[PDB]
Ligand binder design. Structure first.
Ligand code: SF4
Ligand code: SF4
Ligand code: SF4
Ligand code: SF4
Ligand code: FES
Ligand code: MG
Ligand code: MG
Length: 580
């Protein structure tokens, strides 16, 4: 093909869109509703408008290049059209960046500045409450910011195939929201927050727990524990202009102390706990030749997916609590026993890459003796905001260490945040347990990486077993609906709702679409975790010295007795009833 763009001739055999071709050749074309290889097919934003001679104005993001095209991306006519569209969006946008939670990384603001757009009539609603939906334990909607770009609807469809995020007709006007404008939690929504990650503006957010946290920190009698997820140490640096793939574990520990938390632990310790219990359960099911398969239960997006779409599998889920909840349980029982704290005064906070974890923490039965396992969950984004509000110079902080009693972790625990991480970690322990051995080959590279569905055959005690790693909620649907689950007997299956695993969770830093083209965010974030695993002396959960002490002195034998009583949680399908 011969293509002319802004007077420059290109000869190409590529079959692609004007936008992609332009961007591959460093020609600037703006875009808004285009993301994840799709745009908003109904009511296109047209921010990607270009001019094609003999055709007129076209949308670059969904128009294929053709031999003979002569394209202008920067004519007066083009720029006036784009400016007009942005002005029209400003007419439905509460343009008050000052207090806005996307102030520092908003795509819309950048477009407004670029084209110097202005509303025809400022959008200034007085009763914001009718634009806001805060009913969910996990998600919140602020429709005064919504551009109706459809990126959330498209991302939900692509990432989960639930289509829980929909366009709705609300009293004659178009909004996005859940089915029948219900609270997301009361629908088939997984609360995974991929819709948030896709949002260019501050219209979708996590349900804030920041006041729970501040209130607890300032309560004189509360002893506030904080523990961060595997993925936080691989990602939060992004929001402090430190770049991608930077391990900031030590800086986080320092920042948390400077924020006034009373104890600095780590959810990776909880991950090693989950493996103790789950590997023990796996070895049990083997020795009892069933039931199979066993599914992981540490992803609450997946648990909701099972609850909402596959209730028949709930009995197959591992009974071990997730690292967050298992940690939380121990923080109200074991931790008082080694500290003297009154359990009622312990307030346990996690920092997560995840919105669905907020729902998990607030499940009514996730408590014992009136004490919540977990009292608050803040996302990576929320912690970043707390750090900046406190004027803590994150990038400049010295490294400190976690408090060890519930802060040590093995390399198995460290890799939980990547797809296949739980699987690999679990196998390292299950194989040692089953064979009564200390095996040296512990790297299961077959279950790593970004393939949607990953399988491996593993040898445990001279019998062969089949494992699968399901990488993304859409791939769970593919795995089940396609009958893949019946090609062979699976014994142990990992499921993560977010593709890439938790490093790509719904509570993570937003990444602007251009950076996403430059950087494989899923692999770069995961690389930090695998690097930790490689350089840790202990690489099996059951070699965690603090964990071993905890079990020896407090819980006893994993998978039975006190451990089973306290550290496990079973989900139940509803009993048959009519009408349904
Ligand atoms: S969403 Fe963006 S443009 Fe709108 S108020 Fe917030 S920062 Fe400003
Ligand atoms: S939280 Fe996940 S399942 Fe629910 S609407 Fe958003 S993307 Fe869809
Ligand atoms: S909530 Fe965000 S992604 Fe969804 S339509 Fe509104 S602005 Fe677009
Ligand atoms: S994959 Fe991780 S971040 Fe995503 S829903 Fe599951 S637990 Fe949350
Ligand atoms: S970016 Fe092309 S129509 Fe929206
Ligand atoms: Mg399209
Ligand atoms: Mg305090």
């Amino acid at each position: 093909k011969t293509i002319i763009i802004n007077g420059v001739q290109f000869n190409t055999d590529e079959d692609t869109t004007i936008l992609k071709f332009a961007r591959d050749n460093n020609i600037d074309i703006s875009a808004l509703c285009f993301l994840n290889n799709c745009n908003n097919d109904i009511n296109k934003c047209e921010i990607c408008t270009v001019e094609v001679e003999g055709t007129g104005l076209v949308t670059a993001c969904d128009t294929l290049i053709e031999d003979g095209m002569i394209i202008n991306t920067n004519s007066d006519a083009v720029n006036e059209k784009i400016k007009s569209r942005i002005s029209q969006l400003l007419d439905i946008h509460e343009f008050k960046c000052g207090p806005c939670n996307r102030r520092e990384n908003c795509e819309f603001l950048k477009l407004v500045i670029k084209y110097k757009a202005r509303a025809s009539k400022p959008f200034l609603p007085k009763d914001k409450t009718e634009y806001v939906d805060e009913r969910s334990k996990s998600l919140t909607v602020d429709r005064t910011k919504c551009l109706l770009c459809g990126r959330c609807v498209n991302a939900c469809g692509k990432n989960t195939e639930t289509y829980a995020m929909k366009f709705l007709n609300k009293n004659g006007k178009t909004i996005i929201g859940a089915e029948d404008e219900k609270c997301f939690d009361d629908t088939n929504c997984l609360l995974c927050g991929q819709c948030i990650i896709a949002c260019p503006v501050a219209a979708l957010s996590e349900k804030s727990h920041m006041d729970r946290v501040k209130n607890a920190l300032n309560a004189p009698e509360k002893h506030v524990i904080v523990a961060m997820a595997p993925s936080v140490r691989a990602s939060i640096g992004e929001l402090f202009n430190m770049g991608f793939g930077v391990d900031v574990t030590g800086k986080i520990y320092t920042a948390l102390r400077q924020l006034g938390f009373d104890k600095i632990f780590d959810i990776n310790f909880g991950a090693d706990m989950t493996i103790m219990e789950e590997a023990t359960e796996l070895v049990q099911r083997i020795e009892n030749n069933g039931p199979f398969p066993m599914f992981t239960s540490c992803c609450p997006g997946w648990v909701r997916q099972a609850e909402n779409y596959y209730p028949e599998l709930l009995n197959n889920l591992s009974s071990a609590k997730s690292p967050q909840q298992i940690f939380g349980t121990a923080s109200k029982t074991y931790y008082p026993s080694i500290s003297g704290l009154d359990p009622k005064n312990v307030f346990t906070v996690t920092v997560m890459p995840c919105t669905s974890k907020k729902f998990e923490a607030d499940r009514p039965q996730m408590e014992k003796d009136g004490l919540r396992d977990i009292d608050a969950v803040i996302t990576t984004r929320e912690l970043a905001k707390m750090i900046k509000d406190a004027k803590i110079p994150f990038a400049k902080l010295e490294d400190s260490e976690a408090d060890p009693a519930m802060g040590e972790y093995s390399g198995a625990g460290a890799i939980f945040g990547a797809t296949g991480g739980v699987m690999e970690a679990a196998l390292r322990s299950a194989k040692d347990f089953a064979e009564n051995a200390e095996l040296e080959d512990i790297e299961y590279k077959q279950v790593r990486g970004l393939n949607g569905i990953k399988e491996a055959e593993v040898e445990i005690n001279n019998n062969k077993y089949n494992v699968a790693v399901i990488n993304g909620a859409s791939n769970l649907f593919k795995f089940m609906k396609s009958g893949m689950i019946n090609e062979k007997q699976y014994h142990f299956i990992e499921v993560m709702a977010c593709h890439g695993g938790c490093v790509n969770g719904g509570g993570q830093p937003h990444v602007n679409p251009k950076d996403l083209e430059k950087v494989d965010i899923k692999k770069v974030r995961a690389s930090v975790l695998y690097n930790q695993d490689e350089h840790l002396s202990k690489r099996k959960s059951h070699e965690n010295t603090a964990l071993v002490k905890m079990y020896q002195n407090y819980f006893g034998k994993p998978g039975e007795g006190r451990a089973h009583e306290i550290l496990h949680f079973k989900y139940k399908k509803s009993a048959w009833s009519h009408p349904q």
